[PDB]
Amino acid sequence: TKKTLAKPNIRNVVVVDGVRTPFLLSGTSYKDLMPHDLARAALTGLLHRTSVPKEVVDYIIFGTVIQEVKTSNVAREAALGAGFSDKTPAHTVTMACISANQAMTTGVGLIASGQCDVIVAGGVELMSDVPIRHSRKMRKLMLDLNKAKSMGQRLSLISKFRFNFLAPELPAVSEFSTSETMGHSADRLAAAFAVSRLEQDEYALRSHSLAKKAQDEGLLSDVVPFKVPGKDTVTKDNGIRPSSLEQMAKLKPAFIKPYGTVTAANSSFLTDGASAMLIMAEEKALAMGYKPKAYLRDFMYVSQDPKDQLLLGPTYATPKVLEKAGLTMNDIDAFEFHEAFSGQILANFKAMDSDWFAENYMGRKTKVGLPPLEKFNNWGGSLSLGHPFGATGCRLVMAAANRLRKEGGQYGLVAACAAGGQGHAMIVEAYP
Amino acid sequence: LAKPNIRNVVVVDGVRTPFLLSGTSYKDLMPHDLARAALTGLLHRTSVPKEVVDYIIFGTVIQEVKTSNVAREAALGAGFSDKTPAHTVTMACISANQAMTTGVGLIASGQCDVIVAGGVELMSDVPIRHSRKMRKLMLQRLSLISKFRFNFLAPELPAVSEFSTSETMGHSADRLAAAFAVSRLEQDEYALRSHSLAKKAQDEGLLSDVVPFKVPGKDTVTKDNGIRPSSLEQMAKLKPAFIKPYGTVTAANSSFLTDGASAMLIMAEEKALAMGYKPKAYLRDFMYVSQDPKDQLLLGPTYATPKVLEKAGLTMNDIDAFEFHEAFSGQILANFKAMDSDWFAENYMGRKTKVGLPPLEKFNNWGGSLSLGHPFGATGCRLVMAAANRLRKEGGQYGLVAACAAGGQGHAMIVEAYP
Amino acid sequence: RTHINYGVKGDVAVVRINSPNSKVNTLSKELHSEFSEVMNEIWASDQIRSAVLISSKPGCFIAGADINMLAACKTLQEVTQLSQEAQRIVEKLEKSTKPIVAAINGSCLGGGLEVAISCQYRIATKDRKTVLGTPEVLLGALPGAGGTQRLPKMVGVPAALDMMLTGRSIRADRAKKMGLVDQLVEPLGPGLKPPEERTIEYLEEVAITFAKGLADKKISPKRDKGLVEKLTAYAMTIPFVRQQVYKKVEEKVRKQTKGLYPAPLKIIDVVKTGIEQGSDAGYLCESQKFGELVMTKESKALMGLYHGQVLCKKNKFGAPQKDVKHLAILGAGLMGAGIAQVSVDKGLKTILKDATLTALDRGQQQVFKGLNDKVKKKALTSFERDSIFSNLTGQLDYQGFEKADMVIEAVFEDLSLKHRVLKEVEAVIPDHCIFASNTSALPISEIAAVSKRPEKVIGMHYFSPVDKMQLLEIITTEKTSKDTSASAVAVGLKQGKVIIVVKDGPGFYTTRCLAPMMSEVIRILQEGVDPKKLDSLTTSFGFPVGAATLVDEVGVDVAKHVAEDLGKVFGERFGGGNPELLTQMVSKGFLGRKSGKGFYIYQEGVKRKDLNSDMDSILASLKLPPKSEVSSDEDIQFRLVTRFVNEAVMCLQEGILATPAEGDIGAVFGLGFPPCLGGPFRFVDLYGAQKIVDRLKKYEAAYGKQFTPCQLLADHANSPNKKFY
C-alpha cells in the first residue's frame, strides 16, 4: 500500500514522551512570569511525567525568539531550576517560529552523530514586553566610568545640549528587519493565491471547533497542568473560542484596511507557553525500559525570499523532506502544520496544488500535492491553541505522533512556516 | 588518524573582524552589522559560490531584539542566498563553538555538505524598564485608563552583569584563582605574556584570521585594540577589580569588553576537494561539558579536555598545539593547577590520575582572548581558526582547543591538520 | 598545648585556636591559660611586630564555654570573679602594643565575639555558618567579657543593645555593614585541598597581609556612613537623647518581657552605667551583675532548657537503615504545606497530595510564599527559591507513591478517615516505607490497627504553625519498630525540629497535660472572671499566650473535639468547668475566627482593640460563684499551673515521658510553659517539690475535686528530691 521503513546503518532515534504548558493568551495569566519560568515548568512537567533520571540526561536544548536579557541562555537557567544535573549542559537556539524545531533537530543531530544518547529538546516564549532606550541609555552609561575624584560632571553639559531637537529615543520590535508585518504578509500572500475572506473565516472556525472538541475529548495529552504562583492554577488553553461563520465575517480586517481579507479571528494570537520533550536513541529508550511513542524520521529546513514569499515554508519544505525520505502525499496519513494565519495555510495549499507555481518557482516537474484537508490538523492547530514562538515547534511533532497512536496510522508529516522567510518539515514514523 | 565509516569534515577557510575594545569604533553599529561584515569577509576571501551554501549558523549572547535571528538577518545582507536558511545559537562564551558543532552535526548527519559557522558580539548594552514599560503596554473613560496607573508609579531600571545564579564572571575568577592558590604575581605574569606574544604575532602578521573592515563612521580598521603589554612592575602597581582590597584579579590580568564577529566555511571533505579547495584542517572530535556554576563555573577545560582527548584516543603528548580561551589570567593558571592535580582529578573529576598540565610552551602561542579580546560567541571561532593556523605555519598535526564559559559550562575540540 | 597552637611568619605571629575534641572551640579554663601564655611570648618577643588568630577547627571560630559556668559556680562572686579575670585578658588584647587581627571563620558567639571585639581588626568569612552574636541573654545571663562596653562603642547604642538583648545571631555581611566586622571575605571553591581547608588557608593569608599593614600604621582608608547614619550617630552623642533610648527600650523590654526575666533589664543598665559613667565603672558593673545573674533562678532554668534542647536535637536511636529520600505529605492543608516547606527547602524531594485541586493550590501557595518570604528576609536567592519549589511535586492521585520512603498523614481528626487513608496509602507504598500520623487526640495504636504493617506505623505530632514552630512530638506504640522510629526522628531533625519522644497514650504527653488546664479555664471563665483578666493573669505569669485567647485562637470547636474525646477517656480529674457553655458557643454560633472576643478588622483580619459583644449574655446564664481561699488572683494562676505540672510529672511516672528534660523541652516549646520557670520538671526542682504539693492540696480538698498529687510528685515531696539533678 505504501513504501514503509527507516534507514539501516544510521542509528534510530525516538521520542519517549513529550509535554507542554497550557498555551495561554499573552497577558492573561502568565503575565507576571519570566520566560525561563515557563521553561522551568515545562521541563519539570517532563521530568515528572517521564520519570527520567536526572543523571542520564546528556544534553538539553531549548528554543525561543524574544530574549530575557537576564537569562541569555534560557535553556541553561531553566534547566538548573527544574532539577536536571549540573553536568547536563545546555544551549539556547533561536530560529523564529520554528525555534522549537531547531531544538529537536540540533539535538537529534548530536544523537545520530553519536555524541550522546539522551537529549531533552523543547522551547519557551512569553509574550511580555522588551522595549528599550537608545540615547537616554547612551547618555545613560557614559555616566558610569569614573573620573579623577568626581570631575565627570562636564561629561554632562555636552549631555544637556543633546536632547534638544527631539527629547530622547525608545524603540522595540514588531515588523521585520526587512520591513513588513508578519500578518500583513498573510493578507497579501492570501490575495496572491486568491484566498477569499469567507474561505479564511471558515478554516479559522474549523481549528477553533476541532480544538475545543479534541480538548473536551481530552486528546490534548501533551499539556501538563501548571501552578502559577499568582493565579489558582491552569490546565486548559485560552485560544479555544469558536464563533459562528456569520460572526467572523461581521468582523473588520486587521492588517490591510479596509479591503483586507485577514482579520483578528482568522489569525493566531500573542501566546505565552513552553514545551519540553524527551528524545533519545532507540537502543537506550528500550534499554531504559521505555515504550517509545514514535520515531524521529527525516526532516528538512528551507528558506524563501522574505519580501514576497516568507510564509511559504511548507510548500518548499514538504517535498524536499518527503522525497529525501522517499514517500509521497499518499504514504502520509497525518498532517500537523503550523497555523500562523487562516490565509497562510489555505494559500500554502493553493501553492502546493499548482503545477504552475511548482514549475515556475519551486523549479520542479509537477505540483507538490494538496494534503487531504481531512487528515490535516485534526486536533486543532496554532490558530486555536496558540503560537508561542519557538515553543510551538514541539507541540506539533508531539501532537503528530500522538494522533498516529490514538487515531491510527504510521507516517505523519509536520511542517511549519516561519518568520525570517524560512520553513521546516519533518517525517514522524509511529512506533509499534 | 581519524574515523572511517563516518564522513570526514574540514575547514576550508575562516575569518574574523578585528576584535576591538567595546565602545571604541564599532560603538555606532548593531551586532548583525558586524556579523554581516564577517560573512562578507569570508564570502570574499573564500570566494565560495553564494549558491552551494546549504546552511548558516551564528552564535551570540546579548540579543538585538530587532534582529532576533542575528544570523538570518546578517546572512541576507552579506549576500548569501534566499534559500540558504540559518539559525542563531546562544551558549555563553562558547556560543561560537556551538555554531560550528551544530553545523558539523548536520554534515556528518548527511543533512548537508557545506555550512557556514561563526558568531558575533557587540558590547554596548540595551537597558530597559521592566514595567515603566508595562503601564506602557496600554496602547470619556479612556483618559482615566492611566490615572489607574498614575495611582503611584516608580519605574527606574533593569539588570544584566552578574549571573542568573548570582555572581560576577570575574569575581568567580578571583576566588577560583585563590581556590587553587594562584598568586597575583603569577597572574600579572601570564597576562603580560599574551599581550606581548600577541603583539609579536600581530607584527609578524600571523593573525591571518582577521579581515579588515570599513566602518561607515571611522576611517577603517585592520588591527585589534587589546594589544597593550606593560611592565610586570606596572601590572602589580595596579588595584584589584573584583574582590577588593585583598584581590588577586585586576583589570590588567583580565580580559575586557570587546566588539567583534567571526565567520568560517566548514564543509565535507569530499566536497571541499571536489570544489577545488585546499582545506586548512580537519574538524576532528569535540566535547561539551558542564559544572556547578556556584563554586566551579570556570573549570570547563579541566573537565572537558579529558572527555574529548580520550574519546578521540590521544593524550597531552599527542597534542602539540593548545589554543585555550583566556577569560582571566587567574582563570587559566588555575585551570592548569586543577588539571595538574591528582587530588582534584580523583575527588571531583572522578578519575584515576590527573588530566595533565599542558606544556605552557605549546599554549596560546599567538596570544589569546586576554590580549586580543573576548566577544562572547564570536571568540569560539577565532580559537579553532588560530589553532589549525598554528599547525600549518608552526608545524604539527594535533591541536586541542578548549574554552571555559559562563553558565558553568565548557567545550573542547580536536583539530587535525591537513596535508 | 592541646587547645591553642603556635607558629610565626615574618614579623607576624599566627595563633591557631582548636579544641582537643575539635568539635567546637569553646573557652575552657585551661585554654584560657594556654592562650594567656602564647600572648606573652609574642607580646614581649621583639621578633614580632604584629599578629593574627584564626580557628583551625572548620565547624567554627569560638562559642564560649558553659563547662565551668555552673560547674565552678561556688559563691555569687566566684562567678563575678571569673568575669573580671576574662575582662582583664581581652583588655590586654585591646590595649596591645602589637596589632592583632581576628580571623573569624565559622561560629563566633558570646565569649568569642567579646574577643574579636577587643582585637584591632576583625575579618570574617561570608558564610552562612559564620554568625556573630551575644546569646548570653538567652541563658538568663549577659556578656561577661567587655561585651556590654565594647559593642555599644563599636556599633552604636541601639544595635549594641538589640544584639545583647535578643541574642540574635548576625549574618556575616550584615555584621560587616553594621560595623561589627572590619573586613569580609568570600569562601573558596575546590582546589588542591578541600574547600573548607583551602578557605581557612586563604583567610589566614589575608588576615596576615592586613596584620602586616596595621603594624606599619597604614590604615587611613575608612568607609562613609552617609547622611542618615552620620546624623543618627551624632544625635546619640546627646545625653538626653540616650535617656529617651534607654527608656523606650526598657519600656519595650519591660512590656514584651512582662518583667519576669532579669537579664534583659540588667543588661540595659550595665550598658548605660558604663557609657554614662566610666568604662571602669562599666566593666566592673558588668562583671558583678554577670555572676549576679548566673545565680538567678531564671538563668538556672534556661540553662536547663538550653541543655535539654541540645539533646532533643540529637537522634535518640542513631541513624536508620534507610535515609528517607522520598517523602509524601497527605493533605495540602495548613500543617501539610507547613510540613512540606520545612522538608522541601531542606532538599528532601517531597510529594504533596490532596483531594481537590483547589486545596492542592492553597498548600502549594503557602510553601511558595514561605520560600518567597525567606527570599525577602535575604535568607534565600530568588533562584534558590524557584529551584527549591521544583522539589515540591504536588498531585491529587498517588502517582509517585510507589517510591515513597516515608509518608506523613495530615488530614482531619477523624479516625474513620485516618483509617481509610492508611489503607489506601499502605496499598501502594513499598514495604520499607514508614507511615506517620500528625495527630493530637487519636492514639497511634487505634490508627495503626488497620495497618498491614504496624511496625512501620509511628506518630509524628508536629506543632502549629509548622512553618515557624520547632517542636516535634514523636509518638511510639509498642508494636512500633525501632528503626521505624530512628528514621522518623532523623527526618524531624533534618526538618530542623526539636524532638521529644513519648510512648503512645490516650492524649500523648503534650495534648494530655494541656487538657486539665483547658477545663480549669472554662471553670474560671464561668466563675465571674473574664477574658481580659484571665489573659492578663496568665500572660503576666510568664505564658506566651493568654489562657482565654489561647482557646479563642486554637479552636472553639476543636476545644470540645478533644476536651470531650479525652474527657471521656478520663473525665475523672479532668473535670473542671461545664462543657455545655463550651457547646452553647458552637451550637449558638460562636467561633475563634469571628464572634468570641479575639477578632480582627476589615477583610484583612487586621486589628484587635476589641473582644466579643455577647458571650457575656450566655456566660451570665450559667456560672458558679467563687470560693474563699481559691478565688485569689495568685491562686487562679497556680490552679492552672499545678494541674498541668501534675499531669506532666505523672506522665514521667507512667513512663510516657522518657526523661524530665524532654518533658520540659516539650512543655515550654510546645505548650508555652513559662521558660523562666524552666519547664514543669524544673519548676518542681526550683519552686519546691513540697511547696508545690501543699499548693496543690490547697486546690484539691479546698476545691472538693480529685485534683490531687500523683505518686511521683508526692514522692519527691516527702523527701529532699529533684528530678533533673
Swiss-Prot record, chain A:
Keywords, alphabetical: Acetylation, Acyltransferase, Disease variant, Endoplasmic reticulum, Fatty acid metabolism, Lipid metabolism, Membrane, Mitochondrion, Mitochondrion inner membrane, Mitochondrion outer membrane, Transferase, Transit peptide
Keyword Hydrolase applies: no
Positions of the catalytic residues: C97, C417
GO MF, one annotated term: acetyl-CoA C-myristoyltransferase activity
InterPro entries: Thiolase (IPR002155), Thiolase-like (IPR016039), Thiolase_acyl_enz_int_AS (IPR020615), Thiolase_AS (IPR020610), Thiolase_C (IPR020617), Thiolase_CS (IPR020613), Thiolase_N (IPR020616)
Modified residues (N6-acetyllysine): K31, K147, K252, K257, K291, K307, K320
UniProt intramembrane stretches: 132-179
Pathology noted in the entry: Mitochondrial trifunctional protein deficiency 2: An autosomal recessive metabolic disorder of long-chain fatty acid oxidation, biochemically characterized by loss of all enzyme activities of the mitochondrial trifunctional protein complex. The disease phenotype ranges from a fatal form characterized by early-onset cardiomyopathy, cardiac failure and early death to less severe, late-onset forms with myopathy, recurrent rhabdomyolysis, and sensorimotor axonal neuropathy as key features.
Name assigned to this protein: Trifunctional enzyme subunit beta, mitochondrial
Swiss-Prot record, chain C:
Main subcellular localisation: mitochondrion
Site features described as Important for hydroxyacyl-coenzyme A dehydrogenase activity, chain residue numbers: H461
Positions of post-translational Phosphothreonine modification: T358
Site (Important for long-chain enoyl-CoA hydratase activity): E114, E136
Phosphoserine PTM positions: S279, S382, S613, S719
Omega-N-methylarginine carried by residues: R362
Modification type N6-acetyllysine: residues: 9, 23, 92, 129, 177, 212, 252, 258, 266, 289, 297, 313, 316, 369, 374, 423, 468, 482, 503, 532, 607, 627, 691, 698, 722
A Gene Ontology biological process term: cardiolipin acyl-chain remodeling
Gene Ontology cellular-component annotations: mitochondrial fatty acid beta-oxidation multienzyme complex; mitochondrial inner membrane; mitochondrial nucleoid; mitochondrion
Cellular location(s): Mitochondrion; Mitochondrion inner membrane
Example GO molecular function: enoyl-CoA hydratase activity
The protein's Enzyme Commission number: 2.3.1.-, 4.2.1.17, 1.1.1.211
Family of this protein: In the N-terminal section; belongs to the enoyl-CoA hydratase/isomerase family.
Disease: Mitochondrial trifunctional protein deficiency 1: An autosomal recessive metabolic disorder of long-chain fatty acid oxidation, biochemically characterized by loss of all enzyme activities of the mitochondrial trifunctional protein complex. The disease phenotype ranges from a fatal form characterized by early-onset cardiomyopathy, cardiac failure and early death to less severe, late-onset forms with myopathy, recurrent rhabdomyolysis, and sensorimotor axonal neuropathy as key features. Long-chain 3-hydroxyl-CoA dehydrogenase deficiency: The clinical features are very similar to TFP deficiency. Biochemically, LCHAD deficiency is characterized by reduced long-chain 3-hydroxyl-CoA dehydrogenase activity, while the other enzyme activities of the TFP complex are normal or only slightly reduced.
Protein name: Trifunctional enzyme subunit alpha, mitochondrial
